[PDB]
Amino acid sequence: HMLTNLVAEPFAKLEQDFGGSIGVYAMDTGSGATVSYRAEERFPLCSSFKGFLAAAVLARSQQQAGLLDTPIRYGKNALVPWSPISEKYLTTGMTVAELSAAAVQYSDNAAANLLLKELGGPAGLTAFMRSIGDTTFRLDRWELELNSAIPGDARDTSSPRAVTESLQKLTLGSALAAPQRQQFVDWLKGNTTGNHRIRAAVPADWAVGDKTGTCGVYGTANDYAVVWPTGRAPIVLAVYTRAPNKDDKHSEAVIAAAARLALEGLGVN
Numbered sequence: 001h002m003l004t005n006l007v008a009e010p011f012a013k014l015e016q017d018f019g020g021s022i023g024v025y026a027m028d029t030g031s032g033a034t035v036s037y038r039a040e041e042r043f044p045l046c047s048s049f050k051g052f053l054a055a056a057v058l059a060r061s062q063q064q065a066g067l068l069d070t071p072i073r074y075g076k077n078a079l080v081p082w083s084p085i086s087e088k089y090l091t092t093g094m095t096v097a098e099l100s101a102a103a104v105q106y107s108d109n110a111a112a113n114l115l116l117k118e119l120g121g122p123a124g125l126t127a128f129m130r131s132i133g134d135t136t137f138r139l140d141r142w143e144l145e146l147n148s149a150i151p152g153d154a155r156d157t158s159s160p161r162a163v164t165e166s167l168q169k170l171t172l173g174s175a176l177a178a179p180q181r182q183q184f185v186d187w188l189k190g191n192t193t194g195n196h197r198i199r200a201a202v203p204a205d206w207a208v209g210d211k212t213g214t215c216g217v218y219g220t221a222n223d224y225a226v227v228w229p230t231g232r233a234p235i236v237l238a239v240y241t242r243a244p245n246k247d248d249k250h251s252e253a254v255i256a257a258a259a260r261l262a263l264e265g266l267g268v269n
């Protein structure tokens with residue numbers, strides 16, 4: 001509204017310096033006030049689906065109790081590049097919950113693919129997001145192919161506004177049962193990969209859970225987070241980037257700066 005107008009110039013200058021596109025949607029869950037910048041444009045999800053993948057695994061777990069406990073066996077073939085946890089448990093296998101934790105907190109690529117299989121593949125995760133009223137989200141492909149981040153390709157994309165709206169439902173709304181909800185929040189709170197992104201703009205005395213995504217091409221990287229400032233309502237926000245050239249580099253500093261501007265535009269500072 002009027003807060004989106006305030007931050008337009010600062011965002012324009014930030015993305016001009018970055019040399020690509022920044023997408024931001026930030027919601028004050030108390031006032032319902034919002035900051036938007038390219039909030040309805042598609043950006044590649046990269047690893048950021050792994051968070052919604054974990055919440056879909058949890059949603060299913062509310063039907064079939066013992067799902068989270070189920071051991072999963074896998075071979076060397078499952079181990080696609082950046083599977084830092086699953087590669088340690090190849091000879092033993094892991095449970096669904098451990099794969100979910102690995103996928104959210106270490107962004108583990110084998111773990112994601114193994115969990116995708118369990119839900120009916122990318123169409124299965126998409127089906128879950130449709131069920132919580134997200135008509136924007138689409139996953140099409142698997143790790144690593146979903147990372148192509150091809151300009152104008154809608155495959156494996158969502159919008160910052162849909163990402164924030166869906167995150168609010170799954171972390172703070174009624175989309176999950178309270179146990180699965182608090183479990184989702186706790187995997188996000190325990191994320192190890194986001195220290196240089198939204199977390200870098202969040203004071204140390206505020207709770208935060210996040211999931212990162214990094215495609216490795218087209219300056220395409222992102223983060224979404226729930227943030228619990230002290231003595232005010234939680235903030236939910238999504239910060240997505242991409243860039244026009246394949247060889248363009250992503251910037252964690254740009255994501256952190258975009259998060260600062262979002263929080264500043266909401267006046268939470």
Ligand SMILES: Cn1c(=O)cc(CP(=O)(O)O)c2cc(F)c(N3CCCC3)cc21
Pocket residue numbers: 046047048082106107109144147193211212213214215216
């Ligand atoms: C370059 N780079 C990172 O910096 C961080 C991450 C972790 P996250 O931010 O995604 O959660 C990362 C993940 C990949 F799968 C990745 N591949 C590069 C080729 C295809 C994907 C690079 C990554």
